[PDB]
Design a protein around this ligand. Structure first.
Ligand SMILES: Cn1ccc(-c2ccc(Cl)c(CNc3nc4[nH]c(Cc5ccccc5)cc(=O)n4n3)c2)n1
Ligand SMILES: [Zn+2]
Length: 351
């Protein structure tokens, strides 16, 4: 019941709070890479996007960092009505990414090749730690590093644009009735990001990225400004999200051997959870004592998304993350049956 859910959260918390040098070993290797990257004229603006960055909770030795780089005077062209994938053009100063142009369009291929080369140069330059660099599965993540053992670090490269968000976001981020119109504008004044990624041959498109929004909302998540600052206003929003990510991660681990769940990842969970926040904007709909009901309502909504094959991207509402062409009926049905079994049995995977 809600009692088991609380126990799971307690153990997830105790794993987080424990003394770990892995952060230190990773920060040591990352600060090395950021400096050597800064010596190359093409990557002088590079910096960490966010100064606990883990894709997984069940694998804590696995880190995820993102190197932002501003590209000002930026021009974008929507690719094939995908609403999310774009060509990156420029606008008479010397563009420091000149070596990376293939026509007017900036090449992700070229730019990642110099990215990896510099990082590959610096990994063999470190004598303190034995760091192994893996090879190009995709491009996002750009580089995977194995520090000592058990420590793996996925470094993604991302352009930054400090201009208005593209017009396909106009109806997105629908937090007005929950966090307010004022906050929605504040957020839309923040930069946006682009990371390399193909749609489905190989065009040179970039996918919009909003990696920096979630932490802004998670750490100020109530309709009330004092939500979760006193005993009278403890809510369970953050606990519901943790549980949903942990449920998905434990199922992916359980069924890692077959491919059924490989198409799902925690941003599907986050998308669905924040849609539930939009549907339920009042802090009183997330009272701590209703953890069991609130979480069950998150599960149920995510399942409805699976069965109906509709999960609208939080930022670009016309982009359906669960459409037929992205995830086949069979995978969604398999995830549906796993989660429904779990719920019918008070989640044995949480143990
Ligand atoms: C990593 N991946 C793989 C595929 C995509 C992707 C596909 C299509 C579009 Cl249309 C986009 C659009 N861009 C985009 N959408 C999100 N959604 C969240 C999750 C979230 C929701 C609500 C509040 C906070 C966070 C995280 C994130 O970083 N993004 N980035 C992203 N991304
Ligand atoms: Zn709260």
């Amino acid at each position: 019941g809600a009692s088991k859910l609380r126990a799971v959260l307690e153990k997830l918390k105790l794993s987080r709070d424990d003394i770990s040098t892995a952060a230190g070993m990773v920060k040591g290797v990352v600060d090395h890479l950021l400096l050597r990257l800064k010596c190359d004229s093409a990557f002088r603006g590079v910096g960490l996007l966010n100064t606990y960055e883990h894709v997984k909770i069940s694998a804590p030795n696995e880190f995820d960092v993102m190197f932002k780089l501003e590209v000002p005077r930026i021009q974008l062209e929507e690719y094939s009505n995908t609403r999310a994938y774009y060509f990156v053009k420029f606008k008479p100063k010397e563009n420091p990414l000149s070596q990376f142009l293939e026509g007017e369009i900036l090449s992700a291929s070229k730019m990642l090749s110099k990215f990896r080369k510099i990082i590959k140069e610096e990994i063999n330059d470190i004598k303190d730690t034995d760091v192994i660099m893996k090879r190009k599965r995709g491009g996002s993540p750009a580089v995977t590093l194995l520090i000592s053992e058990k420590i793996s670090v996925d470094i993604t490269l991302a352009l930054e644009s400090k201009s208005s968000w593209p017009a396909s976001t106009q109806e997105g981020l629908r937090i007005q009735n929950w966090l307010s119109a004022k906050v929605r504008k504040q957020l839309r004044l923040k930069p946006f990001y682009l990371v390399p990624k193909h749609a489905k041959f190989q065009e040179e498109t970039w996918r919009l990225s909003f990696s920096h929004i979630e932490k802004e909302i998670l750490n100020n998540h109530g309709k009330s400004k004092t939500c979760c600052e006193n005993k009278e206003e403890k809510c369970c929003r953050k606990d519901c999200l943790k549980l949903m990510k942990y449920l998905l991660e434990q199922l992916k681990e359980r069924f890692k051997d077959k491919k059924h769940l490989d198409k799902f990842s925690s941003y599907h969970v986050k998308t669905a959870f924040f849609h539930v926040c939009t549907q339920n904007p009042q802090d009183s709909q997330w009272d701590r004592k209703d953890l069991g009901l609130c979480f069950d309502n998150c599960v149920t909504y995510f399942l409805q998304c699976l069965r109906t094959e509709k999960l609208e991207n939080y930022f670009i509402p016309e982009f359906n993350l669960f459409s037929s062409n992205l995830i086949d009926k069979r995978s969604k049905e398999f995830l549906t049956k796993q989660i429904e079994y779990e719920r019918n049995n008070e989640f044995p995977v949480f143990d």
